[PDB]
Paper text:
The CD4-binding site (CD4bs) on the gp120 subunit is an attractive target for HIV-1 immunogen design. The VH1-2-derived bNAb IOMA directed to the CD4-binding site of the HIV-1 envelope glycoprotein is of interest because, unlike the better-known VH1-2-derived VRC01-class bNAbs, it does not require a rare short light chain complementarity-determining region 3 (CDRL3). These findings indicate that IOMA-class NAbs developed in multiple HIV-1 infected individuals and provide important genetic and structural information for the design of CD4bs-targeting immunogens aimed at inducing IOMA-class bNAbs.
ACS101 binds an epitope surrounding the CD4bs with a buried surface area (BSA) of 1578 Å2, only 30% (484 Å2) of which is contributed by the ACS101 LC. ACS101 is framed by the glycans at N197, N234, N276 and N362. However, ACS101 clearly interacts with the N276 glycan, burying 184 Å2 of surface, of which 44 Å2 (23%) is by CDRH3 and 140 Å2 (77%) by CDRL1. For example, ACS101 CDRH2 interacts with the CD4-binding loop on gp120, where residue R71HC forms a salt bridge with D368. Instead, ACS101 uses a tryptophan at position 100cHC (W100cHC) that is located nine residues before the start of FWR4 to contact N279. These results show that ACS101 shares HC contacts with VRC01-class bNAbs and/or IOMA, but binds to residues N279 and N280 in a different manner, using other residues at the tip of its CDRH3, in particular W100cHC and Y100fHC. Superimposition of the structure of the AMC009 SOSIP trimer in complex with ACS101 and the same trimer in complex with the VRC01-class bNAb PGV04 with a five-residue CDRL3 illustrates a ∼2.7 Å shift of the V5 loop away from the tip of the CDRL3 when AMC009 SOSIP was bound to ACS101 compared to PGV04.
Residue numbers in the entry:
A (entry chain L): 1 to 106
B (entry chain I): 1 to 108
C (entry chain G): 2 to 82, 82A, 82B, 82C, 83 to 100, 100A, 100B, 100C, ...
D (entry chain H): 2 to 52, 52A, 53 to 82, 82A, 82B, 82C, 83 to 100, 100A, ...
E (entry chain D): 35 to 58, 66 to 134, 150 to 184, 188 to 309, 312 to 323, 323A, 324 to 354, 356 to 397, ...
F (entry chain F): 523 to 550, 569 to 654
G (entry chain E): 523 to 550, 569 to 653
H (entry chain B): 523 to 550, 569 to 664
The structure:
């Protein structure tokens, strides 16, 4: 939704490092874009806190970046198990979620 | 209160060291400060403790204290150092500043 | 940093002397204030010290007639001598007092000595 | 920590639905609770929140006048009462804990860790 | 050489327990309070800087905890009303505002069934025919406040224990956090009346020059904005319904006090607020908000919350708990008398404490209280609209967190511990 | 407190009277418990400082001379900067990290090594 | 306790005899609370006096030399009239009027000046 | 604190070393009562020793001079037999029933009479 | 609890008095696997207010 203009999908081979991004412009007023991951049939979960803080239970493969209007998630060493829909979370006096990017693994 | 006594004057050749003394009762047990006054000018501290010089004052200035005597030592005295040099102590029994007589240093 | 003296420059015999000195930088509550005078041809004579609070002391030769005021709002101080004589002709110096907290109150020579203002007493 | 939605429901247009969400494993009053819906083809839409201690609320503009969010402290449960349901409202409605503890500068935002399983509400003629 | 000094003028932020002081029946009493200092002269810490923070201020937390404790201790020994949690036979005696309810006390004293009646407000009655339950009959215990105990908002001063000091910020327009330049040291705080209210703050202090609006973060719309006025507005409220008290013997030795009869007619409770003072005050508030939000329009709207305590304005006049309708006041748009109807309740879920409730006995009616409007608790709630709506911000009444009322009076204070020892280099032995 | 914003040197000139000894007692149910605990703690704090000064052989003195040379690795500042520039608050913070060390040195040098 | 009914001179020995910590001793939830509170208060009183003595320049002194001359308005009498006649109880009753004055003078003369 | 088995002399050589005080604490409703009582008593014990040393004319110095003669009703054992042939524990038991007596005597001579003598010097 | 350092040891206040409990301390632990595999679920009953 709004500025969180995520690509419809991404893909790559196992072991490939890939990037998912929304790079919405309304970042600076909150100065924060967090990330969520969701599996089909399941509730979404937080993978990244604030900007690039990885909580317990989340793999080191997942590390984001924020800069200017940049808002991105990099998944290093892509696993089959990482197939999911990924989303940007932002705020502009209200919570805005991105449409999501569908990640598949080749 | 407290006695600080200095000779009226000393005299050195240019380039020689002046030994400007100050005496008093157990003067060496008190912090002894010295200052330089150019005629017509406000004075400046040249030393505040044994071997402790303030910034802004050149290496010519040194001095020390022992026993009942304090000495201001000025090596390589320049004509520009012709001045009245004085000693100072604080007298805690009166809680007052005590100044010495002042020694005129002549540079030949 | 700088201390600048001022005053009538000339007072009459039997006139009370009042000298106001301004502190240009650091607020006056930071250090102790002190006045010293030098009669022409003489060495230094300490007058007294004051502070932000009521901690003060004076030279017994003047003590019964001397106070120094504090103006915190303007960073000013003023030396007042209720004397009558021409023997008080002197250069008055505005100095700030520094010290090290040791036994016997080892007060430092007053580094920021000021410029000195000559006060003449004459009819 | 767990958070559990009531099950799925089916309504006709011009209807209303009541969806509960039960909290467990943490002090209810320590965190804000947000509601979000997942609409097919649209990703996620934030709807609103409650304070849980004071039942202060915030609702998105398109829910004002139709959505009420309330709570019952004695059961540590929050409810969504939504009226004037349209077929356009078919979505999975989820609850989650907002932020961090209430007493934090951004404590209402950036978490949503315990998302519940989500309750599908279908509205259809 | 390391020299040891004692009596050194330094301190560190620290927490300790503060104590009650009052001028010297009421709950604020000398078993918990001591006499005040008639001359608590401030000491200015000339040229020091201190960082203050009204949020996350433990003085607020203590005020909250002790007020709760005092209330619990005060109600602890009072009459349980549990014997009355039976089905009521209710009819009437604005319309059916007050109902005449009949019931069977089947235990009481001496194990005889006693037919009895009482007059209750509809707000304390739950349908279950014309059969009703008490609003908090089950799931909690309702106790009657003791008739001998008053809860008057006597200004309370908090005082530091020896070894501690309270620093106070005298800066004008302090925004609630950050450095304060004009810092003074005090022995005790100013007296703060422990007044409890929701939406609108009563009998607090006033701002020195202008209305000052404080927030932890204005962007974060989840936070409460505290508005302190520099001019008060006086409002007088009343409960005109003259009545008689009925003493019912419920407990083996104790008594329940209810309303037995109404004298004269029934009229809705109300508050009288000036038309002029109110909208002039809003103009001032709106001006400050316009500055804070960069010229977007300021609008005032109604509470949309789910708590009866919040959607209605809430206060206590004498022993009568009032729920007043303020939708009439928060209804305006600021770019470039008023009678508020009220309701009365007998069962109060004070503190949002689960499992507890209290009952408020009648005080014979014809009560009017004048009070000072000193500030507001409100929140902003719009967002995600830069390309969707016009540039208008909307604010609505907010509250229910009692710590906000107390925070608004403690914003200028901090507690520190005095640390008299320290060391420094010297030249001595 | 007092002129805490003054330099350390200036502040020390009134150290004698800053040390006003504003202790409870000389100045003069859960509530009962809290009130009692507070009195006990005030006593413990008072004694703790007196005990420590006793350990260092500083009891009875406002200003106590040590047997420990100043260790300059604790700070690069000259006495002039320390005493006639910095305040006591600033100073203690600069050397707050060496407090335990300093205390240990004072205890040994004034008692075990004399 | 001891020869309270004796002249102050005689009592100069009594004085030190009774300077025991009579403020402390060995004995062995309400009753426990009442006694604990009493014990804490006894400690505060003890310290209050020790602190006051330190303030006046008295430490470990049962007989402490002062820096304040006796002021005759304070029931002068004579030295033999008190040391060899009046008891401490009687004496203090006459001096009670000046207690505050005396304490202020003791602090300033012995230590502050 | 392991010197207890050493002789009195040997152990006294380390009183300074072992004068650890152990007064400063660390980590600075019935259990609350019990612990509060424990803290209060610890303070009381501390103060009792300090008051007692003060009443005897002791400065805090670990070994005090005296003004009371030792006598044979307490012990007629020679000094080497006491200081080098015994531990402190054994010694304390040997003279334990004279503790009250000795303490009263220490007080009477070293500080009660001595202070009276000091007053006489001040009168002069 | 704790184990004996070298061998099983037996302590008693008195060994002829058969009324005393003998405390036996082992120098090795024995591990016991206890379980109740009977799966259940909880019922919440509103007993009192
Ligand atoms: C009441 O009024 C006072 C002024 O009188 C305000 O005081 C200060 O306000 C600033 C506001 O920014 C406070 O916070 C500062 O945050 C900066 C963050 O920048 C980095 O991080 C952000 C994300 O968090 C990135 O977007 C950004 O690109 C940067 O990477 C810090 O850098 C600041 O520290 C620096 O400057 C200060 C001087 O201002 C120096 O002292 C520091 O050493 C450092 O160089 C700073 O932390 C600031 O903390 C407030 N001061 C105090 C004492 O609290 C109040 O904020 C205002 N309050 C309200 C409610 O309005
Ligand atoms: C754990 O191991 C220890 C050994 O390390 C055992 O301890 C011994 O237990 C016995 C039984 O209780 C004790 O025996 C007592 O001896 C007394 C005499 O002691 C003096 O004389 C002997 C002479 O050989 C010296 O060795 C000794 O040092 C003393 O100088 C008797 O008086 C005792 O009672 C008898 O006399 C009284 C008189 O009034 C009668 O009333 C009694 O009925 C009885 O006849 C008794 O016999 C022995 O002293 C203990 N040794 C030590 C070193 O203390 C533990 O018992 C053991 N524990 C277990 C659980 O097994
Ligand atoms: C002690 O008092 C002094 C004097 O008031 C305080 O310092 C002063 O701080 C203000 C800023 O709050 C300075 O004003 C402005 O400074 C900027 C930057 O140089 C300049 O561009 C502006 O035009 C304006 O002058 C003021 O100059 C400064 N004065 C001095 C002598 O430093 C000081 O902060 C106080 N300290 C404490 C601990 O309270
Ligand atoms: C209830 O609230 C109203 C405001 O909403 C108060 O209104 C006015 O308050 C003032 C001060 O109490 C009254 O002033 C008095 O006016 C008379 C006029 O004859 C004058 O003689 C007195 O000296 C005094 O100035 C005023 O009457 C009153 N009414 C008006 C005109 O608005 C009112 O007092 C409040 N009533 C209470 C106390 O509950
Ligand atoms: C603070 O808020 C209170 C509302 O709780 C304001 O009203 C005051 O309320 C008390 C009762 O709680 C009134 O006292 C009572 O008066 C009746 C008179 O018949 C007497 O029978 C009772 O025993 C009791 O004394 C008090 O008069 C009333 N004050 C006013 C001006 O109406 C209070 O005024 C607010 N402001 C301040 C500064 O406290
Ligand atoms: C407090 O907030 C509510 C909610 O935003 C405000 O009510 C809203 O008012 C607007 C303007 O009158 C309504 O928009 C228009 O309504 C007409 C008639 O139904 C429709 O044909 C237009 O297409 C458009 O929707 C809006 O529907 C209405 N919302 C609700 C839930 O009632 C209210 O005016 C605000 N009050 C204050 C004092 O700010
Ligand atoms: C709302 O707050 C104001 C204060 O901002 C309260 O004003 C009070 O007004 C009365 C006079 O009507 C003052 O009493 C007088 O004080 C002078 C003091 O010099 C004395 O000489 C007179 O004999 C008389 O006692 C009262 O002090 C003043 N209160 C304060 C705190 O200054 C007003 O009553 C408050 N209204 C409500 C409803 O709470
Ligand atoms: C209670 O008062 C009585 C009467 O004054 C005290 O008894 C005796 O008092 C005299 C002094 O007045 C003591 O001094 C000696 O008197 C004899 C008289 O023969 C004289 O020869 C000596 O040179 C000396 O002056 C006398 O010792 C004392 N007698 C006794 C048995 O004590 C009595 O002491 C007072 N009670 C207390 C506790 O002080
Ligand atoms: C438990 O308590 C009993 C009774 O007090 C202790 O009994 C003692 O046992 C020893 C060894 O059997 C006896 O020693 C010998 O007894 C024969 C008797 O004919 C005698 O001829 C020998 O000369 C020698 O005394 C001892 O007398 C007997 N006790 C009496 C009072 O105690 C037993 O040892 C205790 N066990 C433990 C573990 O404490
Ligand atoms: C409280 O502050 C407001 C600030 O707006 C005061 O109202 C007047 O505001 C105008 C600007 O719109 C200024 O020109 C006037 O000088 C302000 N008047 C005063 C007295 O400050 C309002 O009057 C203040 N109230 C009180 C009691 O001081
Ligand atoms: C001050 O004390 C510290 C801590 O004991 C000393 O720090 C280090 O000491 C080791 C030897 O034990 C040296 O190898 C390090 O190089 C020292 N580090 C630093 C920064 O000095 C320190 O030397 C002492 N300084 C003085 C002047 O006595
Ligand atoms: C003892 O001290 C008092 C207190 O200073 C002296 O009496 C005061 O005298 C002034 C006038 O000079 C009066 O205004 C005070 O009211 C008096 N106070 C009291 C308590 O009497 C007194 O003269 C001194 N006496 C001696 C012998 O020194
Ligand atoms: C624990 O204690 C037992 C005795 O209770 C030890 O048993 C030893 O067993 C061997 C044969 O396997 C014998 O030769 C030894 O003489 C026994 N020792 C003793 C003291 O009885 C056993 O080894 C001990 N366990 C451990 C780990 O030390
Ligand atoms: C109360 O009870 C009477 C007698 O059974 C019945 O006639 C009346 O309608 C009841 N009223 C209500 C409100 O239940
Ligand atoms: C109405 O009040 C009367 C007393 O006037 C009482 O007898 C009757 O039972 C009450 N009716 C109800 C329904 O409570
Ligand atoms: C009391 O109980 C009797 C018997 O069941 C019933 O007829 C009567 O209406 C009840 N009265 C009330 C007030 O509930
Ligand atoms: C609003 O402000 C105007 C200013 O002219 C005033 O006349 C009016 O009484 C105020 N209040 C209301 C409710 O209209
Ligand atoms: C702005 O203010 C003017 C004058 O009060 C008014 O005519 C206009 O309608 C307002 N516009 C908005 C955005 O409310
Ligand atoms: C003194 O300065 C040097 C850098 O020139 C630094 O490495 C050293 O750690 C400093 N020492 C202290 C005590 O601050
Ligand atoms: C002061 O003297 C009067 C008698 O003139 C007496 O009543 C009063 O109690 C005395 N004050 C004190 C503190 O003893
Ligand atoms: C020891 O001193 C006490 C107390 O003075 C005395 O009673 C006893 O007779 C003395 N004994 C010897 C042997 O000197
Ligand atoms: C004190 O009494 C105990 C018990 O009788 C005894 O063991 C000890 O040796 C006694 N001390 C003296 C000096 O008699």
């Amino acid at each position: 939704s709004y500025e969180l203009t995520q690509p419809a999908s991404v893909s790559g081979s196992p072991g490939q490092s890939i990037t998912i991004s929304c790079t919405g412009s309304s970042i600076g007023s909150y100065d924060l874009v967090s990330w969520y991951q969701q599996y089909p049939g399941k509730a979404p979960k937080v993978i990244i806190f604030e900007v690039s803080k990885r909580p317990s239970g989340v793999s080191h493969r997942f590390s984001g970046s924020k800069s200017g209007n940049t808002a991105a998630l990099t998944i290093s060493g892509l696993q089959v198990e990482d197939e999911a829909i990924y989303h940007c979370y932002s705020y502009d006096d209200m919570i805005i979620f991105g449409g999501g990017t569908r990640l598949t693994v080749l | 209160s407290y006695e600080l006594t200095q000779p009226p004057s000393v005299s050195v050749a240019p380039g020689k060291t002046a030994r400007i003394t100050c005496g008093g009762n157990n003067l060496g047990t008190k912090s002894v400060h010295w200052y330089q006054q150019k005629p017509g000018q406000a004075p400046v501290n040249v030393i505040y403790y044994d071997s402790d010089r303030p910034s802004g004052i050149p290496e010519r200035f040194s001095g020390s204290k022992s026993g009942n005597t304090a000495t201001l030592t000025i090596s390589r005295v320049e004509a520009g150092d012709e001045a009245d040099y004085y000693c100072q102590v604080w007298d805690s029994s009166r809680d007052q500043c005590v100044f010495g007589i002042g020694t005129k240093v002549t540079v030949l | 940093v700088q201390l600048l003296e001022s005053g009538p420059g000339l007072v009459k015999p039997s006139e009370t002397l009042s000298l106001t000195c301004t502190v240009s930088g650091v607020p006056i509550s930071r250090h102790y204030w002190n006045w010293i005078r030098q009669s022409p041809g003489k060495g230094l004579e300490w007058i007294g010290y004051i502070f932000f609070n009521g901690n003060a002391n004076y030279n017994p030769s003047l003590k019964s007639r001397v106070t120094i005021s504090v103006d915190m709002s303007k960073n000013q101080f003023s030396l007042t001598l209720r004397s009558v004589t021409a023997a008080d002709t002197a250069v008055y110096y505005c100095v700030r007092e520094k010290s090290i907290a040791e036994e016997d109150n080892m007060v430092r020579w007053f580094d920021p000595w000021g410029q000195g203002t000559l006060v003449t007493v004459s009819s | 920590v767990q958070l559990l939605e009531s099950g799925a429901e089916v309504k006709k247009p011009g209807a209303s639905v009541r969806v509960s969400c039960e909290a467990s494993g943490y002090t209810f009053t320590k965190y804000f609770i947000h509601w979000v819906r997942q609409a097919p083809g649209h990703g996620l839409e934030w709807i609103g929140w409650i304070n849980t201690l004071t039942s202060g609320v915030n609702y998105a503009r398109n829910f004002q006048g139709r959505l009420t969010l309330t709570r019952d402290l004695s059961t540590e449960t929050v409810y969504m009462d939504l009226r004037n349901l349209k077929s356009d409202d078919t979505a999975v409605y989820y609850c989650a804990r907002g932020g961090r503890g209430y007493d934090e500068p951004w404590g209402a935002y950036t978490w949503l860790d315990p998302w519940g399983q989500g309750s599908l509400v279908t509205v259809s003629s | 050489w390391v020299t040891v000094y004692y009596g050194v003028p330094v301190w560190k932020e620290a927490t300790t327990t503060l104590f009650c002081a009052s001028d010297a029946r009421n709950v604020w009493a000398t078993h918990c309070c001591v006499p005040t200092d008639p001359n608590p002269q401030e000491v200015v810490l000339e040229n020091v800087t201190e960082n203050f923070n009204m949020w996350k201020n433990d003085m607020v937390e203590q005020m909250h905890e002790d007020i709760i404790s005092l209330w619990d201790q005060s109600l602890k020994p009072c009459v349980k009303l549990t014997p009355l949690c039976v089905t009521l036979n209710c009819t009437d005696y604005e319309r059916g505002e007050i109902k005449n309810c009949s019931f069977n006390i089947t235990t009481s004293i001496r194990d005889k069934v006693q037919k009895e009646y009482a007059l209750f407000y509809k707000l304390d009655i739950v349908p279950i025919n014309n059969s009703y339950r008490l609003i908090n009959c089950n799931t909690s215990v309702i106790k009657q406040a003791c008739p001998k105990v008053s809860f008057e908002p006597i200004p309370i001063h908090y005082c530091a224990p020896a070894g501690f000091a309270i620093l106070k910020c005298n800066d004008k327009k302090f925004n609630g956090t950050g450095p304060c330049t004009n810092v003074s040291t005090v022995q005790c705080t100013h007296g703060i009346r422990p007044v409890v209210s929701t939406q609108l703050l009563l009998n607090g202090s006033l701002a020195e020059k202008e209305v000052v609006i404080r927030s932890q973060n204005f962007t974060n719309n989840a936070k409460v904005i505290i508005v302190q006025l520099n001019e008060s507005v006086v409002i007088n409220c009343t409960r005109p319904n003259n009545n008689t008290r009925k003493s019912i013997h419920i407990a083996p030795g104790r008594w329940f006090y209810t309303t037995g009869a109404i004298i004269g007619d029934i009229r809705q409770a109300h508050c009288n607020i000036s038309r002029v003072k109110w909208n002039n005050t809003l103009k001032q508030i709106a001006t400050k908000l316009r500055e804070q939000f960069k010229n977007k329009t300021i609008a005032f709207n109604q509470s949309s919350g789910g708590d009866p305590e919040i959607v209605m304005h809430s206060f206590n006049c004498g022993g009568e708990f009032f729920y007043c309708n303020t939708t009439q006041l928060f209804n305006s748009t600021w770019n470039d008398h008023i009678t508020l109807p009220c309701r009365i309740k007998q069962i109060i879920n004070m503190w949002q404490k689960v499992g507890k409730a209290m009952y408020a006995p009648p005080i014979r009616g014809q009560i009017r209280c004048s009070s000072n409007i000193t500030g507001l608790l409100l929140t902003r709630d719009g967002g995600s609209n830069e390309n969707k709506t016009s540039e208008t911000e909307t604010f609505r009444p907010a509250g229910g967190d009692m710590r906000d009322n107390w925070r608004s009076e403690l914003y200028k204070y901090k507690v520190v511990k005095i640390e008299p020892l320290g060391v420094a280099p010297t030249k001595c032995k | 407190l007092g002129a805490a914003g003054s330099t350390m040197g200036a502040a020390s000139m009134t150290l004698t009277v800053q040390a006003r000894q504003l202790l409870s007692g000389i100045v003069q149910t859960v509530w009962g418990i809290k009130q009692l605990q507070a009195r006990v703690l005030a006593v413990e704090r008072y004694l703790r400082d007196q005990q420590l000064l006793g350990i260092w052989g500083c009891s009875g003195k406002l200003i106590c001379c040590t047997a420990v040379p100043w260790n300059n690795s604790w700070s690069n500042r000259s006495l002039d900067m320390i005493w006639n520039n910095m305040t006591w608050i600033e100073w203690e913070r600069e050397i707050d990290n060496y407090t335990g060390l300093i205390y240990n040195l004072l205890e040994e040098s004034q008692n075990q090594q004399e």
